[PDB]
Design an enzyme around this catalytic site. Sequence first.
Site, short mmCIF file in Angstrom:
data_model
loop_
_atom_site.label_atom_id
_atom_site.label_comp_id
_atom_site.label_asym_id
_atom_site.label_seq_id
_atom_site.Cartn_x
_atom_site.Cartn_y
_atom_site.Cartn_z
N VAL A 197 0.86 -1.17 0.00
CA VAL A 197 0.00 0.00 0.00
C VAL A 197 0.91 1.23 0.00
O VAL A 197 1.86 1.29 0.74
CB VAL A 197 -0.93 0.02 1.23
CG1 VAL A 197 -1.87 1.22 1.19
CG2 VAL A 197 -1.74 -1.26 1.29
N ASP A 302 -12.44 -10.77 5.53
CA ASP A 302 -11.16 -10.47 6.19
C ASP A 302 -11.30 -9.27 7.11
O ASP A 302 -10.51 -8.33 7.10
CB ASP A 302 -10.02 -10.27 5.15
CG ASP A 302 -8.62 -10.27 5.78
OD1 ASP A 302 -8.46 -10.80 6.91
OD2 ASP A 302 -7.68 -9.71 5.17
C1 H8H Z 1 2.98 6.86 10.53
N1 H8H Z 1 1.86 7.35 9.71
C2 H8H Z 1 2.06 6.91 8.30
C3 H8H Z 1 0.88 7.42 7.45
N2 H8H Z 1 -0.42 6.94 7.98
C4 H8H Z 1 -1.42 7.74 7.29
C5 H8H Z 1 -2.34 6.86 6.46
O1 H8H Z 1 -2.01 5.51 6.69
C6 H8H Z 1 -2.74 4.73 5.85
C7 H8H Z 1 -2.46 3.36 5.82
C8 H8H Z 1 -3.16 2.52 4.98
O2 H8H Z 1 -2.91 1.18 4.90
C9 H8H Z 1 -2.27 0.66 6.06
C10 H8H Z 1 -3.14 -0.52 6.51
C11 H8H Z 1 -2.40 -1.47 7.47
O3 H8H Z 1 -1.08 -1.77 7.02
C12 H8H Z 1 -0.24 -0.65 6.72
C13 H8H Z 1 -0.90 0.18 5.61
C14 H8H Z 1 -4.19 3.05 4.17
C15 H8H Z 1 -4.99 2.24 3.29
N3 H8H Z 1 -4.78 0.86 3.18
C16 H8H Z 1 -5.49 0.03 2.28
C17 H8H Z 1 -6.11 -1.15 2.72
CL1 H8H Z 1 -6.07 -1.61 4.41
C18 H8H Z 1 -6.81 -1.97 1.84
C19 H8H Z 1 -6.88 -1.63 0.50
C20 H8H Z 1 -6.25 -0.49 0.03
C21 H8H Z 1 -5.56 0.35 0.91
O4 H8H Z 1 -5.07 1.40 0.15
C22 H8H Z 1 -5.92 1.48 -1.00
O5 H8H Z 1 -6.17 0.09 -1.22
N4 H8H Z 1 -5.96 2.84 2.60
C23 H8H Z 1 -6.17 4.13 2.68
N5 H8H Z 1 -5.46 4.92 3.46
C24 H8H Z 1 -4.48 4.44 4.22
C25 H8H Z 1 -3.74 5.28 5.06
C26 H8H Z 1 -0.58 7.29 9.42
C27 H8H Z 1 0.60 6.78 10.26
#
Ligand code: H8H
Length: 445
Positions: A197, A302
Amino acid sequence: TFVALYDYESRTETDLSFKKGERLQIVNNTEGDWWLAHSLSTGQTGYIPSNYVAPSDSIQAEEWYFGKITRRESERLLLNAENPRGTFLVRESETTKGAYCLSVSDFDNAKGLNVKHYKIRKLDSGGFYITSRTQFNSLQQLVAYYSKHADGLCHRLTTVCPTSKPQTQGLAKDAWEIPRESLRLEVKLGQGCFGEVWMGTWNGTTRVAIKTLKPGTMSPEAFLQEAQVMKKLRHEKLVQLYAVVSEEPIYIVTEYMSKGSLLDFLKGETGKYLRLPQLVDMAAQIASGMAYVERMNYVHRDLRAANILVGENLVCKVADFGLARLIEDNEYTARQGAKFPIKWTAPEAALYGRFTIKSDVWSFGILLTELTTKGRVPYPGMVNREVLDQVERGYRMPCPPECPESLHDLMCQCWRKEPEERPTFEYLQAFLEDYFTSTEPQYQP
Ligand SMILES: CN1CCN(CCOc2cc(OC3CCOCC3)c3c(Nc4c(Cl)ccc5c4OCO5)ncnc3c2)CC1
């Protein structure tokens, strides 16, 4: 004319930027989500998101009119830290069709920040009132009056409740299957066994989250078919799917969630002062998103805290829906291997491949334990390969330390052997929203 309810920044060469309040003519609405507009201010033209405007002189044109919003969601907004006393909005009444409600922020030196709610009724002769003493020809007249004098309200109306800009429908008119080159990846957010991601940018202008899948993870054809389904799911507590790149390596482009996964939010300094009322509120939001899934006859497969994402105002949204069913890895397909979340998986699903909304309810119960433990891993004693054996012979996690038994009991309902005796998400949402019961009057005199 229409009027802009929010600012909008142009994302493409054929859309139209505008500011809150700008007067716009809609010059082609033979569409739904993106309309051709004409600024009466600048004379420029371009497409706009239709949910960002309303007819001039319509009730929807008023910035304090929030339409159909639940009292709980209106409370979330009004209880924001930065809101003065007498911050307010008007919404539709849920208990009386045809009626409205003025919801108003207050501060009490006993009770702290609270919200008062006044039912606005119409006098059949057609006048609007909160008390019979004082009646108005319109809602706007009412808000005008109480903006100048509290009278019987907890406080004068001072400040229109702020909110976040709506999600548009898509990134842009007819944007769906997008070219790979339209995306810049900027900051890596995560890496799992099937892909990564990234935070990134679409078309040089738009913040998005981008998930990539390793080639050979799933057929692009099956992915595209499922994506059409994922695309129909629209709910305030489901992360919005914007667009896809459907040839290998596949990209899933979505809404970016500013505070990240619930799992990390619960840990360390971000979670240190998180208290049960907030944890229950987050659980109710998750339950609400899954009630939509349930209403739509769909299945997540999930559900877990890592797949819940957090935004501003402690908004929680369900992420990652649609993918798990497509995974072609042979072990995962057989509900085994280091890639598969056996600890969140209903035993009928692990053993027989029976994934249903009732197996999601099981997973939600497991999620509840993550919430009440600052995110500790479920079944701490156990490795993945012992969990299923144990749960099949009736093992369940005990009450977490410091968790009240009444919430543990809710988890245990979620973990019933018989999937069909598990609660509905409809039930779970209500139970959780009402978990802390106030004697107090929903409305007032
Ligand atoms: C320390 N800071 C770093 C930046 N973060 C701000 C936004 O963080 C995310 C994280 C996402 O995914 C995390 C989920 C758990 O594992 C680590 C990554 C985001 C996300 N994930 C996502 C998932 Cl879970 C499933 C399908 C996807 C996704 O992206 C689009 O397609 N999606 C959107 N925004 C995210 C922001 C704060 C901490």
